[PDB]
Write a protein that binds this DNA or RNA. Structure first.
Length: 485
DNA sequence: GTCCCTTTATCTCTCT
DNA sequence: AGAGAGATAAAGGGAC
């Protein structure tokens, strides 16, 4: 009988000061719950207004987790203390809240930040890193606790300790390293380095126990070099890829004619369990009715979310080749990255619109879709290729060159925003800008140049605008950063 | 309902 | 340009 108030509330959030859309109320109501939704509406005016000055997106980002209400009340209370007593940016405060049990991680940060920063020479960037996950305060307490005994007695660096703690379940990972480090750097014969690689992913603990167990087994059985097994486990949810390999290695090996190199090459990714399993269902069909080769199959499988890519290829190769006229070779190009499934769906959807009101060739389209975030780049091209070419004096071929990299989208937006100030204000030519953006690292290379030009370092005017440009072209921000030094 | 841990998908940047 | 590193986020599930 309260459903009336609930809906009235979730109808009133649709206006000021928050103006939320369906999918956001859905996001909150989902992960945050009825009580997150209600709290949001209570503090809409208090969260938005000074001194907190939060944004709608920020407020959703907090609310939409187990704890939403708690984390909202906590953030309201602590943001000022964290920023003014502890020199944190509101951004960082938000990143820490935006997880399950915000309240815990915030409070624990406020408490431990001094003693970790002072007494344990950590930087607030690092502490923020560790708090910014689920169970952040477990992580925090376990770092406070174990950092000495881990650095001194086990011989680690604090950067490694930080790296292991900056996953969800960092607590468990720290303790598990503390336990098993000796029983691996000696008993199966591994670098720390390797162990550290293993423990620095979520489920690092699981991956650690699992290896501790199977490294003697799997490495003197199926013939895996132990380097290969580390490879496998020093990845997302390794555990599962380790067992899944223990099962499916001989099979796919003998029953599917797969070399251990490729099985290993598949499991050596996030969700490798799913990649191995799905390759075991679908390796056939794919090579039978689709003509694809085992090589190309392994290929599609050896990026992250292999299973999505595989299944989307099995479902979309024919309609793609048959209707939109693409080669199997091209389809494999588009699938052979992370988010492949997405890349494919977006192509199939967009090849039409793109190759028409934009005059884009299918080859340009497949070029765009054949990198990570391919779908992002596509959508961004579709949105901007009008805005750009026209009211900014570019050509489709250039827009294509800017999209045709990882971060295609970041690059296209950054260009949209910075073209004016760089061309005019600092006297650069569009060919230059385009040169720079047309690499992976576009966004930051642009930003790093624009910065270098608007607040030009006094002992950096040794170099010419065109030398800078040559350098952002060469190695983006990394290279313009190796100058300001 | 709040808090913690695991696994899986996706996206972006770096370094040569 | 491709392998590596890094980072963002959702979807499980267990515990009290």
């Amino acid at each position: 009988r309260a459903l009336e108030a609930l809906l009235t509330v979730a109808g009133e959030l649709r206006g000021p000061p928050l103006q939320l859309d369906t999918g956001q109320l859905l996001k909150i109501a989902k992960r945050g719950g009825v009580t997150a939704v209600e709290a949001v509406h209570a503090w809409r005016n208090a969260l938005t207004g000074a001194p907190l000055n939060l944004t709608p997106e920020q407020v959703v980002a907090i609310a939409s987790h187990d704890g939403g209400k708690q984390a909202l009340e906590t953030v309201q209370r602590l943001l000022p203390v964290l920023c003014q007593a502890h020199g944190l940016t509101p951004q960082q405060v938000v990143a820490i809240a935006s997880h399950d049990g915000g309240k815990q991680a915030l409070e624990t940060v406020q408490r431990l930040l001094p003693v970790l920063c002072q007494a344990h020479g950590l930087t607030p960037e690092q502490v923020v890193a560790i708090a910014s996950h689920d169970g952040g305060k477990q992580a925090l307490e376990t770092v406070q606790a174990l950092l000495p005994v881990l650095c001194q007695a086990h011989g680690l660096t604090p950067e490694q300790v930080v790296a292991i703690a900056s996953n969800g379940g960092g607590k468990q990972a720290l303790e598990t390293v503390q336990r098993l480090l000796p029983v691996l750097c000696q008993a199966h014969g591994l670098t720390p380095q390797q162990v550290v690689a293993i423990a620095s992913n979520g489920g690092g603990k699981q991956a650690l126990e699992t290896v501790q167990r199977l490294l003697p087994v799997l490495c003197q059985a199926h013939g895996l070099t132990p380097q290969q097994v580390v490879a496998i486990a020093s990845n997302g949810g390794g555990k599962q890829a380790l067992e899944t390999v223990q099962r499916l290695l001989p099979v796919l090996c003998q029953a599917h004619g797969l070399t251990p190199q490729q099985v290993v090459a598949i499991a050596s990714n996030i969700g490798g369990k799913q990649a191995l399993e799905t390759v075991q269902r679908l390796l056939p069909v794919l090579c039978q009715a689709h003509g694809l080769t085992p090589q190309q199959v392994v290929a599609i499988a050896s990026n992250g979310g292999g299973k999505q890519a595989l299944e989307t290829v099995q479902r979309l190769l024919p309609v793609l080749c048959q209707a939109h006229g693409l080669t199997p070779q091209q389809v494999v190009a588009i699938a052979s990255h992370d988010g492949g499934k997405q890349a494919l769906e977006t192509v199939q959807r967009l090849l039409p619109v793109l190759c028409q009101a934009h005059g884009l060739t299918p080859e340009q389209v497949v070029a765009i879709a054949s990198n990570g975030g391919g779908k992002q780049a596509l959508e961004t091209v579709q949105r901007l290729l009008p805005v750009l070419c026209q009211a900014h004096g570019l050509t489709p071929e250039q827009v294509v060159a800017i999209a045709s990299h990882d971060g295609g989208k970041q690059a296209l937006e950054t260009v949209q925003r910075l073209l004016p100030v760089l061309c005019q204000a600092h006297g650069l030519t569009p060919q230059q800008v385009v040169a720079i953006a047309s690499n992976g690292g576009g966004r930051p290379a642009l930003e790093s140049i624009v910065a270098q030009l608007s607040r030009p370092d006094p002992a950096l005017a040794a170099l010419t605008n065109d030398h800078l440009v040559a350098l952002a072209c060469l190695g983006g921000r990394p290279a313009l950063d190796a100058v300001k030094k």
